[model samples]
Target chain A: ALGYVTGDMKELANQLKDKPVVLQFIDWILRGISQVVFVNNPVSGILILVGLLVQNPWWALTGWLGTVVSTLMALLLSQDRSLIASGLYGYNATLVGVLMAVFSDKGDYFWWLLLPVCAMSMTCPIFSSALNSVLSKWDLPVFTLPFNMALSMYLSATGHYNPFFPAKLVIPITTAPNISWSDLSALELLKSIPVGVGQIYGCDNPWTGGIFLGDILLSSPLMCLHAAIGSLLGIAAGLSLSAPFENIYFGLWGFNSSLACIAMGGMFMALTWQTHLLALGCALFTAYLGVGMANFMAEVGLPACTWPFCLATLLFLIMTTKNSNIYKMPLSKVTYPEENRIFYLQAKKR
Target chain B: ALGYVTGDMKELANQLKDKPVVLQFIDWILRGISQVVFVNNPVSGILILVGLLVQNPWWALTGWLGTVVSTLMALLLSQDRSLIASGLYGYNATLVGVLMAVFSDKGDYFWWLLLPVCAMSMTCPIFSSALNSVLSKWDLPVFTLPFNMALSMYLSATGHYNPFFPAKLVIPITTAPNISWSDLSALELLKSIPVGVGQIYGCDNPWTGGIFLGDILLSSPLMCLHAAIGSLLGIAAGLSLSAPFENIYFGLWGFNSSLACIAMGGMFMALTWQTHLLALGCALFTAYLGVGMANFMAEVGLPACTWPFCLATLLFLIMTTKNSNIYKMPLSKVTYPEENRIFYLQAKKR
Candidate 1:
């Protein structure tokens, strides 16, 4: 319920027939974008678009294409109209597109873009169905596992066959700016915050992190706070482990922990003092797992991607199955916290 | 239940008091040794002794001490008397002893020998109890995971503190005899078989393999066949993956697949043609997993040991929880195949 959508969308759309066709399309696109934030808010979607635009217009376009194509595919292939409106298939397909765009050469656009776009758009629903059947038995939600598995397999196999695979970038690390440990500069702290956000997508620029932070802020201020805290925790852990300062500054440990924080903070489990502590612990632990998994993947000549987050979150969820004290957010037709909160309040009044 | 002992023992032992002490001791030792075989049989234990003796008197002595100390500890602990008689605590403690003896310098007898022997003797029951509580909730067996985790941790940590830690050996493969693929010599094939079995314990010597094979033969001829086939399949997988031939010949890939075969072949699941094929598939898959895990571990500077096997087997068992069609070997007071088979058959009669 945490990762899926439910409801009668066709009837709802019929009731809202006065809405313009263009507006509906825009809404669908926005919904698709919101999925990445693990929420369903058009404002969040707009902020993500702005974030991607700030990084590279091409990346923004590619992600949009992925969402549009996947939604179209779902409409053409399946009768789950509510799922289409909810953008259930959009997020994974968007990831596939972003991955291809990042990993493949920009010069050879057709093979890199067209192949993965078409493949992912058509395949995501089928993969999700298969994943759901298996995971449902364990009462475990299928988070981004399908996307991770699909993309990892595709990327690994494509590396062998594709002649024009982009040469991997060697991230440059500069000498750390002099600042006393006890008295950090305000400018340095502010700049470090963006780097933390940027690291989630392997970006090292503070501007990119700022954009990502804006995207999360549009969704929920609490999630933005969690991301910032998780990033700081990640950097702290990496530094304590004697990892390169450059890597830490670039946010190398940020992505998994950030995602884990978002998941555990309040998305799946309701917010509590205990859940907050759990989120912090999970964030730190995932940072550690990320480093180990990254090293392991390097030896195997494969990218670690979001595997650390997927594995860490899954293990935590699985272990929580028997625990009665932990309160899980119930699945419903709506996923946004504001809406769910309103729904609960109204139900309680009744 | 599949990996634990259950039932009253004193009454059963009283009925057999007339049996000679020599025969009874042989049975207890064999049962202890059979723990490595993932079975409980005095005959299997004797074969393991013969196998270890054939390889090195020291290995045999270490294994004996493991069994003797575990049995003594079980008596000293004074809980679950039947479990002690079943030799449930012997295999892992035996492994701890063998590992210390193999990895540490012979000259430093007290720290390497006495320390691990006493530590493992006292610690194994505690570890088993902890493993059982968690694994049982999923209806999964606690195989050699505890042993692998304990030994790997000890070896890694001890390297920093102990002066007598043996320099890890870099196995050589220049001595392998060449043979035509079409016309393999019978002697060459026969000699290769033991090397396959020896690899399970990280040994490559045909003599060690011979002892292991003899141990399996003492338990059940079918299990011996499983070991041989599992070995061949492991080698084949490693070769196909272009892994180092030296590592393959030394049985680096043999242990996990061999254990997987035994678990899947007929030990955990009922013996059937389908189960046989499943075992073969699992063996091949585990071999691949071992190579990947081995590479991963190398980057972390940790020995791979039996982790691949433990992970593969545990995953398989956990997945099997949903498959009602598969008949799992129920845990019982009696563990010997002959006794279990009789018990199962009698249960069917009811």
Candidate 2:
């Protein structure tokens, strides 16, 4: 039995290593430190669903194939390089792959979703760079918790609303026992929700909750402590922001973003500056604008490609991503770089 | 409503932080991190149970209250400290808090839990010192999957077998609301028969899991990677070492030190360090024998204090703490007498 098992294992390894799709799945299962660490990627699932529903082959293909390929590539890359260990490639590749899949599925509906993806993608590098600038000046615990929670809720809702495309993407082509989609039980369908979410979000979007930050925060004491505090502030802020949009929007977005912005502002005040009030005002204003624009777009039945909504969203992304800097460097120093005045100094002798 | 809610929250936090019994419950929940991160702290819950059951007021009081006090002290000490920002203090405090909790609880059982406490406490510094030892030597993917699986199982089991303490300790604390203690349903309880077998045969030991390599193996990704391979090897070695009585004995030890030695040997071999294998074998064998003698002394039920186990544990600790040539530099090449050779070598290479 042992010998047979060993032989079978070897055979399987050989077969998997050779077939790109199987290898991709294996990579998804095995590679990259962050992939294994954070079980919260929902973006990939969202993209795939959007792709399939719109019959945009690009979204569908990217949703399914992107996940597998990016995970595989990430795992393979991580083996040889530490830089890729955080699963960033897994995320970005998944995003790009989703785009590819969506385009492949349906060409006409392509332009509609493109702006949102572009806007969201730009947030990644911007967020990353902004974090680098601010981490030195900020208290991660004070700053990140509210941001993470708001991000998590947003991504989660995004996944919930989107579904997967290229239905056959989940099935392996191997001559093994094939399970029919009809045979899938209710529990199985429920289980696929997370997967569906992952496909749309593509592993890359920082908001999807599968980034290296989650692992660092959830697993580490410092992160958890800060997260707890931040989350509380976020909930309060979110509620306040959502109040104005209560009669307009259907669900969480109106409230969540406002709360998130407020929390972020408060964190920035605590960590770097005294712009808490200004930031709060900005959050309120943004929330009102977002709700108004979303409602207007919905009422007019502007296709997913509506320019006004897309432009507004892109502007929001720029604002939020840029505002992260409020917590990075002290407002005084950021406002006047010449003086090099410091705020939120951590290691300096008091 | 707002005022009432704020008042309630404050009261809850104060009660959770200040009251000894309530603090003990919190300590129990936090103990999960200790179990997951460090191996030597495994028997703490067991010792706490013994303390509770003995009808000794000092033992019970110390077991519950000491941990709470120490944890708060750690948190207080870390405040305004630069190390807190980097999260270094938080992690270290967690280790210190856990060890102190275990020490206080076990101290009541046998006063000797102190020696192990001292030994275990050294792991915090030792692990930090050896941080770079594992940089390039082990396969993180393989190690993580199994580790994660085991962690999930341990967490699941912990929720069930919690506080394994007597009724004295169990009865006083009000259980957290909405949290289920019936972790394993009837079906799971029956299914755990196989888990029982697996544990007995040295396939895995939940508390500390198969070995006591201290912080070196845990701190260094390479060492963990190496130890994991070694653990699997020991399972194969167990085929030769196995006997019904021995298996029973192994189970009795909880975290089996002797089996761990075999696993350590397997690890050295996996790393292709045949010479180190002999040293590990000899050291582990001697330590196992020493533990047995200590356990025997206690088993005669000779008013056995918890000291014997603590003392034996410390002895096992000393065996692993001796830094090998893995961290050494040639005597001729040494400069700065107090400089860490291992660290120097690592820095020079980088």
Candidate 3:
């Protein structure tokens, strides 16, 4: 039944390949995994260390040697067989060492020694028990994570990891090269401060926030595109409309930059006639302000401040305007929890 | 029964405002319309024209007069009982006149006007009827073509047609700008082609294709972001592991600019895995070839030939990869479409 279910599910996946919503759900799942695994502790730290080792061979050797020795010690000393078998605790370090040797300038037979170390590390009684259950329950024929880790170590031990690894990891030339030791040290210090701060804040995980914040900062094209479009609108409108009165209201308020915000605010008001008026006003203002802000940011280094401000203002406006029943909407129509918090002002009414 | 159903439905909608998805969907609907009506069309266009007119009041006055007259005609005709109330058709000539006036001094307005005119044209009776039925049947109120058309016309008529339009429409900062009668004729001819093309390509009406194309081009940030992330991943991998090999590949393949092609090609191969590898390879090769062809055409002053090849190649790539099974899997599990596309494609599939 399990095999049939798995086979049928795989077939279904094949048939629905072109479906959009299906594709979206899959993407969301992947994004969720990226959030969970690479962003989380133990794994993130391991990934970071591995990432660093890929750049530097010296650290790779030290890290891998430590992993092998630790795994062997844990296997012999510990009673929990799963810990020894999973190699979740120490195998990465051995693999790192083997990788260093393979990538090392010396073309010696270091792989022979490294492969055995990796194999022995996996020989813990708990390893077999864990592998049996995973294969039986999951019905996954391939033990990928363990296999890949082992293969990566073997490849490093054999010098194959280096060849494809470098080609795959090219950095852009535009990025400023070379951080001095002091800069590196300062970064490390900053990283450490967060750990202490997390405790003080009574946060179970501050680093999780950092991961999300990092991803957004690293890849925020949506914000950039919005700003660009807003600026373009501003430039076009500013050049055409001779209505100084319209210009003054829009211009004075930085309307082009604030267009998205005002539209959002107006929609919250849900007053159709007023909505149109506010939209027009916002458009005029966006045209007035968008170009100047865009120019200042792009040419003069204003640091894209307008985007956040626009977004924040819109949020605030929505929060304030959402409670009004001007559009014949019932009190229950208000959607936000924040708005709901203000809804039952029975205390004041009483 | 119908009234009761309507009332019941309205009540359900009111209750569902408590549901996050329903609230979000509603907000999105309103925001989308406001953007098209106010920000994209009226404000963007007026601001751009105003900026141009500021340089030389005489030229600006001519354009302004043309806009004012056209707008008045359109608005008045919209309210007129005499005309057949053909939604968008009545304003067609006026819109054309406004476009011609704006582009009279600068030929660049033609490109910007392309999107707006097509957008407005779809609001005509013939087009709107078809659009309304299809959208209503599809159960996608958001897909209402008339709203899109109105937004497009609003964009073009207002002068927010293009980001580059303001600069083109300008009467020069230092020198007297030339105004050519032939340019206006050319602008009219050029505008007709996109509309003609749209007739064949649009879902509801001919002109809609052009409008839809412009919207996608202007608004879709996903494609560029996906390409960029894929490129960066390739670069980082190459630099750290196979820097020498990459350097060799670059040197052999007429390096620098074309490096992106080779890296992207390889990354696509990695991402897509086995499915449609040949097609992806061919697409990448064509893309690489396109750059050279485009450059050569530009040098020979053959502007038309340059873009056709590049655009055709890209379009072909999109169509070919659109249904490929490899796109269904997670980015970690698969490779080519990139994170954004993976997310986007999922939504598309569903």
Candidate 4:
């Protein structure tokens, strides 16, 4: 599922060249994993899977099924086959599926998920294109803005129709068991990165972070280090700012900073000293932006979602004008760091 | 005050001819008017004064003083004499003054106004320049956004410092007496435009609108007509969308539409049939945007302010790419409709 979601089927195919049936099954799983990574990474997907597995196998299965259903819907309906294969239209549908799975407790209510999933899959591409046109001049990526908008609108509209529908689906925050943190433990600090990653999907388990880290290690060891560093910085910043320790401990600030770190560190720029410094600065800024936006969203009774990461990354990208001394990493449809590095190296050589 | 706020000493000088004392007094008043017109027109300022005169001369005097103090502070602090003279640094300070007057009830508390007014004046130029750098690529004007941001931040920050500060200053909404509109009365409809203009400043009185309309008529009869038509269309759109009659009747929908109309009608585009059509479309779109934003703001317990107008106009300006066949109206620092038209004509001849 992680392999397919990241749109690196060729890499997966190369790994499983001899096992056709198993590869096909893996491809199906990859479709499910793709949705989780829409706001995260392949490693984060593994972490989410672990968190769900710990909570309940049904949730894990439901989240996976969402990606599969949405992927199929996009494949069947969208004229542009390339976009579907690249997973452009699948993420939003997958998000709808995940939201339904995580929030809906009633089995009967699961059937209602089809409405939003279908709607998201069909409309996702249209929304993406419109947003692209609007934001293109600013040199800004649409990111998950369209998906968030669609979901918010659907949620608001549905909530209006039947208040109970949305009321019951409100996210349940897990209270951390009492533990001494007067002096932070190494294990607690180490677990914070994945906790932050998991928090992106509303999970609060360190096990999820462990799985996510493992996944990143498999893909790129450098990204794992960067993500961890970003998360730690975010936590430190939050604590320094006198934000609620509970929120910081649970990794509320982790996801945005981590994502921003990955985006700036090497995804959008070569892994140079300047880029690394830029990434750190962006990560810190995103952490602060996340906190501020979170407060505002709370006031409006709206979910923060992954908006902090999206907004922070977009602002960074837009502000990093093309004329700057730093070399811009060419925009690619896929977001794999390895592929991006290879492309950057290839461009540099030329 | 208007001359100082609009930063058009030459225009004010031209208008007042040889009356130095009268010119100085009018300049002070113009500075005050400029804050209100930050979201409206010079005519709207007159309407505000008229509205205030009817309500109480004290309120009117307080409003004017707000602009005067802010303007003086900006001139004192800023090294950029040209910007100060042009009134570029006064609007936000003026807004701070207006908000203090309208919201703060305690006469002793009036002294506290110095804090925001001083802060806004000193920082307004910096904020404007930063916004300009960010938005310049899209050719969109940074109209009153800096002011709004400064005010909102100041209000939020002060609210935190002293609950008494923001509580007493809560905007007062005037309720209209029982009135029938079974048949559209010309007087009522004529009054709606200025009422809409007045609503931009949080006043709901038709007398305020009447004063605004008279002000516009004094400046340019054509602008007064344009404002009226824009207000009417906004009202129509609101009614068509089944928005609350109270909100529509209060001219809540009128402000954005009117501003958008003015912007599209002649301010940013050549006054042709195409531009007129575009203005009408923008006005309708703005009306809808205003309502949607208003609802979102209500959820967050934040006032909509002139944000809908700013956002709607910015979108229109940004989206109306210069390369398009539509004759793009060149942006001028000042926003006098008559001057804009004159420039448009001169440019056309050339």
Candidate 2 chain B least-lDDT 10 residues: B164-173
The residue-by-residue lDDT of candidate 3 on B317-345, one tens digit each, is 34335455433232222222343345645
lDDT of 1 by residue, B3-78 (tens): 2222212343465457876555555555666777675655556666766666666766776787777766766777
Please tell me which predicted candidate would have the highest lDDT against the true structure.
Answer: 1
lDDT of 4 by residue, A171-262 (tens): 21222234334765556656677788655455577776666556555555667777787888788656544444566778887877877786
* lDDT for residue A109 in candidate 3, whole number 0-100: 42
Instruction: Tell me how many clashing residue pairs each candidate has.
Output: 4, 44, 69, 21
DockQ each candidate and list the results: 0.04, 0.01, 0.01, 0.07
Estimate, for each residue in A1-350, the C-alpha lDDT of model 2 and write its tens digit.
43322111234434545677644343332222222222212222232234343444455443344334444444543332232323333444343434433322234445544444443333333333355355334222122221222222323334322443211121111122222335434442332222212222322222232222333232322322232332233223323322222222222222323223323343223333434443443343333333333332232221111122222222222221123333334433321111122444432335
10 residues in a row with least lDDT, candidate 2 chain A: A165-174
Candidate 1 per-residue C-alpha lDDT over A153-244 given as tens digits, one digit per residue, 9 for 90 to 100 = 45543332233343243222246445345553446545665787665554566787787777676656677788888887787777667676
lDDT of 1 at A62: 75
Model 2: how far residue A272 lies from native, Å? 5.3
Best-to-worst lDDT order: 1, 4, 3, 2
Q: Write model 3 residue lDDT over A1-350, tens digit each, in one string.
A: 43322111334334535577545233222222222111112222333344434334443444455454545555565645333323344533333343334334444444444544445345322443455455434222111233224434443344423442321121111222232324323333333222211211111132622332232222222222232233334434544432222222222223223324222232233434444343443444444333333332232222222332342223223221222232322322332222322442332255
Question: Best TM-score goes to which candidate?
Answer: 1
Mark the 10 consecutive residues where model 1 chain A has the least summed lDDT. Answer: A1-10
Candidate 1 regions exceeding 4 Å error are: A1-254, A261-266, A270-327, A331-339, B1-25, B107-115, B164-193, B272-274, B292-302, B320-323, B333-350
How would you encode candidate 2's per-residue C-alpha lDDT over B1-350 as one tens digit per residue?
43322111234334445567545345332342222222212133333223233334333333233333333433332222221222221233233323233223223454443332332222232222222122212211011111212112222211211232111111121343343434424443322222222231222223333232332232233433433333333333332333222332243322233323322332222222542454345333433443454345322211111222223323433343343432332322321112233445465578
